[PDB]
Structure formats: structure tokens, C-alpha cells
């Protein structure tokens, strides 16, 4: 919860394009998405957590209660069912759509925020620092 609050800027990315290919994102969308380098803004209000990502391409925003399933529209256009829980100090998100699923983990590492995405074995890691 609290350790995640703030504005974060992307510093490094690994295998993100490979992850998007596994998810099924198209060539053009993968291209613009990779050039965008969106930030990440996390805030909490009562029991609702909000994660916002801003970029010149598209801004996305989700507000949720930890443990309650909700509808989410991803940056690449998928309409998925999402659920986010707090486990071992990390935010663990599972997205499900058309019989498929992917996991997105957000955790703290030193003074950084690390996002790890997994799709059928393919793993991508993105590191952020406080802006």
C-alpha cells in the first residue's frame, strides 16, 4: 500500500516487446507502446487504490479494492477481468481474458519499484525510480 504511493519514472526495460508479442499485441501497437515510456502514479484513498499511467500515446487508470475482481481496459485494447492482492509486501495482479491469463507483479527493490510481467513463460522486467 503505502510504500507504493508516489510518481514513478521508467529507468530500464527488459523483454517488454517479447512479452507483448506473447500477449498478442499487434506490431504498430507494440511499436508506439515501446516508444511511449509511460510513468506510473499510485495513490490510495480509503480502501481504494488507484494506479495511473501517463504517456503521449494513451493514459490508463484503474481504481480497485484489493481482493475484488474488476473490469479493466488495457493500454493495448484488451478488455480483461483483473484482481489484485497484497502478498508478501507485493501487489500481485492477474488478468484474465478469452481463456488466457497473465500475471503482473509490482514490488519494491531498494529505492526502486520493479514491475515483472509473465505470459506463458516469457518474463519482462521494468524498473522505475521516484520522479
The span from the CA of 119 to the CA of 38, in Å, is 21
Residues in contact with 115: Cβ distance below 8 Å, sequence separation at least 6, in sequence order: 40, 104, 105, 106, 125, 126, 127, 128
The span from the CA of 12 to the CA of 4, in Å, is 18
Q: Which of left, alpha, beta for 2 (phi over 0: left; psi -120 to 50: alpha)?
A: alpha
Question: How many angstroms separate the first and last alpha carbons of the chain?
Answer: 18
Domains of the chain (ranges plus CATH)? 1-131 (2.40.128.20)
Which method was used?
Answer: X-ray
- Which DSSP helix (H) or strand (E) runs through 7? strand 6-14
Angle of helix 16-23 relative to helix 27-36, nearest 10 degrees, comes to 140
Residues at the annotated binding site for a fatty acid? Answer: 126-128
Residues at the annotated binding site? Answer: 126-128
What is the separation of C-alpha 83 from the centre of its chain, rounded to a whole number of angstroms?
12
The span from the CA of 128 to the CA of 52, in Å, is 14
3-class secondary structure, 24: coil
Amino acid at each position: 500500500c503505502d510504500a507504493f504511493v508516489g510518481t514513478w519514472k521508467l529507468v530500464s526495460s527488459e523483454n517488454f516487446d517479447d512479452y507483448m508479442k506473447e500477449v498478442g499485441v499487434g506490431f504498430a501497437t507494440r511499436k508506439v507502446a515501446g516508444m511511449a515510456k509511460p510513468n506510473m502514479i499510485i495513490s490510495v484513498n480509503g480502501d481504494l487504490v488507484t494506479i495511473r499511467s501517463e504517456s503521449t500515446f494513451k493514459n490508463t487508470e484503474i481504481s480497485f479494492k484489493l481482493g475484488v475482481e474488476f473490469d479493466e481496459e488495457t493500454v493495448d485494447g484488451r478488455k480483461v477481468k483483473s484482481i489484485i492482492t497484497l502478498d508478501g509486501g507485493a501487489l500481485v495482479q492477474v488478468q484474465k481474458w478469452d481463456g488466457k491469463s497473465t500475471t503482473i507483479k509490482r514490488k519494491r527493490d531498494g529505492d526502486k519499484l520493479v514491475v515483472e510481467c509473465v505470459m506463458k513463460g516469457v518474463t519482462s522486467t521494468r524498473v522505475y525510480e521516484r520522479a
